Design a protein around this nucleic acid. Structure first.
Lengths: 205, 525, 61, 82
RNA sequence: AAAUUGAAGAGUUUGAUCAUGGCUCAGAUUGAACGCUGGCGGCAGGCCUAACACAUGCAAGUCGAACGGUAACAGGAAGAAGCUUGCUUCUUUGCUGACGAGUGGCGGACGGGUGAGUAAUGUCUGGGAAACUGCCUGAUGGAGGGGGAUAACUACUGGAAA
RNA sequence: GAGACACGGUCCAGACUCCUACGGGAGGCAGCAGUGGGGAAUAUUGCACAAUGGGCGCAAGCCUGAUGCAGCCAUGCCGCGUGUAUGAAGAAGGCCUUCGGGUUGUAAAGUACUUUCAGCGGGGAGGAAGGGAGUAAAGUUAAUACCUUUGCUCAUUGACGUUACCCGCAGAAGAAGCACCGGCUAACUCCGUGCCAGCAGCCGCGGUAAUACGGAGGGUGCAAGCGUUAAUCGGAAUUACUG
């Protein structure tokens, strides 16, 4: 239920960096980011409209590591909820436990954050929570376990987290290794390069 | 010192292999009476008593006179429990007897003295020497005319190719029969039929040379007995416990089933000589019989007992551990735990019965085909038992299948029969043909009869073909592929997805064997 | 009538096969396909792609 | 006769009983005349694991309905706590 | 306060075009089957066809607080004897704890299975009048005095058994 | 019988199966498992009345294949895992080549970290409310007896069961496959075959330079599932009431 292949391949196919690595090293120094993977990568074939919608959907799905079945459930839930479908879907995706752990900087990559959640090292409201897909709600405080609080990778990720922009919907205390999800992130806080309207019309044929 | 240890030590397993019309069933009945399970014993065909032999549960004694179905009876002796295995013996069958022989720790061969050792016994003895199993020789029907003891001993030793040692020596032949033991104690039966029905009175008199005994029996017989006895001592080696264990020498006891005399003596000797069960060897490691944890293998499976509903019973020897009712026993082959809700044991006596089965006791398990021959049930260990004979079939006949439909019915019946050891089915890779082979002609006849009886197909057969089965295994890579391409037509798949070379002629097999030496041709799978 | 897919077959008369439906556009009157790998019809030999459609076990390395 | 009993309406290993007024001949989870409450046997704290419409229950007992042993104990518990 | 938020087309007639018009596909879904592969857990589901035939086990009993009774256990009372001087072996007494069989009350019309038959004698929606209803519940009162049987059982007897 | 024209009740006739001393009897799984048979195809001859409910009983209690559970099946839905971070000598090998190189490719090897799930050992809720013995009080009566109701004390009641869950140990080990790549439709090249073998849901490829067959490399979509088939609706405004 997890993609176990090369991570940079996905980034090359999408053209941009999907943040699948820590970010300590320059992306260009590890891959040919502007070139699609494989033997016939040099050519840039003219993509169809269905193609650009599918590419955007796959781009988001690979960004957050979600699979198709889970993603379609997320879309159904978002469509069911009140308001803008795209904002609801982005909020639902952003409400995942491992995603919030990555935003708080406990894990360098989202895959590392997911392994952290799954390996019983995170506690939501003091209770141990193991499910990577756990939806967190407003005013919830999340923290590392006492046993896992001495891991080198956690601090190694916290220092790296400073290089990236700080989320305005979270409050993290790097000393005690705790954060607080006070509200669901507004679209203006999210990266504007994602055209979520493509996904919301791709899935509603 | 512990009770389980004492019980495994007391348990003994012995099987009887006999020639046609040798009185094995009658002997079995006598054994139960001596063991005290039954107060009275009845001869086959009800010649002297109303009761019938225990071994012949069915009507086989009236139909032919020999047991056609395998029977296991457990009887208790003096501070010991003995497991008795009865196997039908014929050239036509044989393979089933070999499976039973592999499972049983020790074996006894019963032959009527007049009929002799002559045929099928050498083959049985050969399988026992291959496993180095201890063998006991029992002479039968002493009430009838009996040939010279020295001559009988020499001929049986000559056919067997193993040393023959006589525990009991006959001083009488024909109408009057008496015998003498190695301890010099003389056992006599005054009443031929008077004590036959009940337990025979134990009138054994100490001292080889006794004047009253000499006067009572023939004087000439006593003198001849003394000369024959000293000559036997010099000519043939005295019984050695180690040699018997090794299988080098076989103990011989002379007894009469009809007379009911000598069977008790044989039982006493067999119980002292017989040892506690040897550790069986699994492919992973040898498993100790004493060690806890339930380990067993199914030597034989009986099917189609009831026509309307099929209730397969699997005879399994639990080599290690003690069975408990409702215990979950892991099947190694399927890698799954099966609860043994129902397990049939044979008390064979006037006892209440107990659910718990000790190690070395045969257990029948009811199933719908779930259990298969050679399956291993273990408490938790992933160990697969070894030693199943799986001999090659001969005189193969193709199944024509005149009616195009009912093939799935035929296929289900053929695979089920193939799962048991009665018949082996081979399919050539080149063409879609079904060829069925069995070790014996009457085995084919039984298979065809059973198939018609419950799987109810036309089963047209005997289409002309000539074949011999040799299983082919090659460890080397890139050589076996060449062998397959060279003789694809000859090669045929066998059950269990095993590749077997089919030889038109023995000479063809020899030529095939000389060519491609890296590839190994195995008679037994 | 049923079309026997794949390259090469061991099918002779009196063989029990399994038809599954699906016509071939370019044959008049053939409307069904026989599944490869069911009760007697062996799979297509030396097939390494689209193996599931013709019933061949995975080749062990 | 008319009885007031429990209807097992829940998932495996996590039961939840619905206190219903049913004709005693009918099945446990089957036909009932009126539903008068629930009982969650495994409920945690801060949430009501039992609520009974005592007015209707009293009305049915006045109408001749009998009461089960477990239903009697639950009414006893509710009246003792409240 | 909420209880809804909802609608994509494409290929293919022609040298090329527009329209009419059929075929096919992308989507969702199943009591599913087959082919390849296969690690764990949670919640559901599993004869759709032959309402074709069923071996074996269980699936309706209970009440001695309705009644004669003891067929077994297990205690007591009269005892009797090996008398270890206290009840070990044995005769009675249903006297008690209970109870095989029988009479009697209640339940076998509930629970559970299937959709053959039935196109309306059924089902769903909504009205009625000419009705009964053990066990549960409210009121008003009765509950007196007799009789002849019959199982169980005893004796004989038919039948291989029922 | 209150309630049946009554699955495990009665009688008769018919077909079937069984016992027989041949005179005569017994039975009806479309109850739970379970067997032949039909079919593409559908499970265990399991444990317990511990909970809910039903029958009888004043009650203790007895019966319940209803029911609660367990066994098999990826049959469906959902969650998790098969590692994570760093790592250019862009390693070797495969494939393509304009012979310059490109691609598989941070993928692997190496370095550091983690032990989820499976394995081993230890602890441990809840589904259990009741019911039975002793009291104490109240109501009834001549009665402080007997019975009923409510408090308190005492031992107790789990098939699941090695429960869920939690803690500790060793080690990246024990865990990735399926379909497709001419257009519809996201994803392209080389080699063998020459209207043959073959593909196909439609248009249509292949007749000795095939992005359409078969194999390899690469890629695309899904993922403990993936394709194909059967069946219904949609697209079909192609029965149009809306239209």
């Amino acid at each position: 239920a997890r993609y176990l292949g090369p991570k940079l391949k996905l980034s090359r196919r999408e053209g941009t960096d999907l943040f699948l690595k820590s970010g300590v090293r320059a992306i260009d120094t590890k891959c040919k980011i502007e070139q699609a993977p494989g033997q016939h990568g040099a050519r840039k074939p003219r993509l169809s409209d269905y193609g650009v919608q599918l590419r955007e959907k796959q781009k988001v799905r690979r960004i957050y590591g979600v699979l198709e079945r889970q993603f379609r459930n997320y879309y159904k839930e978002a469509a069911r909820l009140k308001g803008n479908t795209g904002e609801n879907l982005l909020a639902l995706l952003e409400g995942r436990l491992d995603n919030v752990v990555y935003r708080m900087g406990f894990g360098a990559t989202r895959a590392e954050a997911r392994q952290l959640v799954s390996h019983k090292a995170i506690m939501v409201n003091g209770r141990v929570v193991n499910i990577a897909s756990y939806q967190v709600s407003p005013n919830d405080v999340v923290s590392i376990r006492e046993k896992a609080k001495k891991q080198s990778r956690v601090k190694a990720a916290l220092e790296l987290a400073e290089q990236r922009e700080k989320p305005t919907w979270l409050e993290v205390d790097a000393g005690k290794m705790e954060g607080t999800f006070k509200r669901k992130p507004e679209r203006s806080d999210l990266s504007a390069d994602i055209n979520e309207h493509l996904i919301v019309e791709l899935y509603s044929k | 010192l512990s009770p389980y240890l004492q019980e495994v030590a007391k348990r003994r397993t012995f099987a009887i292999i006999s020639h046609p019309d040798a009185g094995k069933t009658t002997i079995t009945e006598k054994v139960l009476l001596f063991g005290q399970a039954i107060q009275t014993a009845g001869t086959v065909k009800g010649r002297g008593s109303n009761q019938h032999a225990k071994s012949d549960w069915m009507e086989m004694e009236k139909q032919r006179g020999i047991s056609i179905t395998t029977s296991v009876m457990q009887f208790p002796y003096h501070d010991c429990l003995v497991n008795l295995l009865d196997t039908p013996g014929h050239e036509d069958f044989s393979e089933d007897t070999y499976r039973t022989l592999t499972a049983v720790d020790c074996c006894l061969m019963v032959i009527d003295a007049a009929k002799g050792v002559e045929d099928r016994t050498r083959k049985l003895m050969e399988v026992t020497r291959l496993r180095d199993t201890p063998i006991l020789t029992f002479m039968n029907k002493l009430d009838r005319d009996i040939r010279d003891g020295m001559e009988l001993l020499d001929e049986v030793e000559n056919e067997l190719k193993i040393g023959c040692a006589p525990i009991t020596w006959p001083i009488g032949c024909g109408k009057l029969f008496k015998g003498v033991y190695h301890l010099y104690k003389d056992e006599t039966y005054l009443y031929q039929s008077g004590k036959g029905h009940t337990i025979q009175e134990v009138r054994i008199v100490k001292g080889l040379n006794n004047p009253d005994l000499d006067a009572a029996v023939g004087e000439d017989l006593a003198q001849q007995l003394r000369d024959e006895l000293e000559l036997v001592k010099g000519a043939s080696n005295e019984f050695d416990k180690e040699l018997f264990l090794a299988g080098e020498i076989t103990p011989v006891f002379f007894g009469t089933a009809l007379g009911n005399f000598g069977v008790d003596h044989m039982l006493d000797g067999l119980v002292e000589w017989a040892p506690a069960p040897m550790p069986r060897q699994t492919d992973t490691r040898t498993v100790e019989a004493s060690e806890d944890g339930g380990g067993g293998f199914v030597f034989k499976i009986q099917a189609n007992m009831d026509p309307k509903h099929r209730d397969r019973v699997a005879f399994m020897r639990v080599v290690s551990g003690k069975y408990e009712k409702g215990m979950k026993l892991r099947q190694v082959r399927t890698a799954k735990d099966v609860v043994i809700s129902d397990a049939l044991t044979f008390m064979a006596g006037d006892r209440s019965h107990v659910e718990e089965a000790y190690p070395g006791d045969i257990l029948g398990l009811h199933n719908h085909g779930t259990i298969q021959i050679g399956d291993t049930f273990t408490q938790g260990e992933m160990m697969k038992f070894t030693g199943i004979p799986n001999f090659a079939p001969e005189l193969f006949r193709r199944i024509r299948l005149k009616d195009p439909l009912k093939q799935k019915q035929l296929l289900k019946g053929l695979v089920q029969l193939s799962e048991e050891g009665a018949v082996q089915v081979f399919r050539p890779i080149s063409n879609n043909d079904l060829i069925v082979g069995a070790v014996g002609v009457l085995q084919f006849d039984v298979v065809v009869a059973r198939l018609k009886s419950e799987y109810n197909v036309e089963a047209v057969y005997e289409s002309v073909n000539v074949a011999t089965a040799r299983w082919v295994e090659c460890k080397d890579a890139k050589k076996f592929e060449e062998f397959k391409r060279k003789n694809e037509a000859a090669l045929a798949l066998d059950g269990g997805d095993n590749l077997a070379y089919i030889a038109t002629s023995m000479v063809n097999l020899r030529l095939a064997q000389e060519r491609y030496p890296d590839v190994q041709f195995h008679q037994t799978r | 009538t049923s079309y026997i897919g794949g390259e090469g077959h061991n099918l002779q008369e009196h063989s029990v096969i399994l038809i599954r439906g699906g016509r071939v556009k370019d044959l008049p009157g053939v409307r069904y396909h026989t599944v490869r790998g069911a009760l007697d019809c062996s799979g297509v030999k030396d097939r390494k792609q689209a193996r599931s459609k013709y019933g061949v076990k995975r080749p062990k390395a | 006769m008319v009885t007031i009993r429990l209807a097992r309406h829940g998932a495996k290993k996590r039961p939840f009983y619905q206190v219903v007024v049913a004709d005693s001949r009918n099945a446990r989870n089957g036909r009932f005349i009126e539903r008068v409450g629930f009982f969650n046997p495994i409920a945690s704290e801060k949430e009501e694991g039992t609520r009974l419409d005592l007015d209707r229950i009293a009305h049915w007992v006045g109408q001749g309905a009998t009461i089960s042993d477990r239903v009697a104990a639950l009414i006893k518990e509710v009246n003792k706590a409240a």
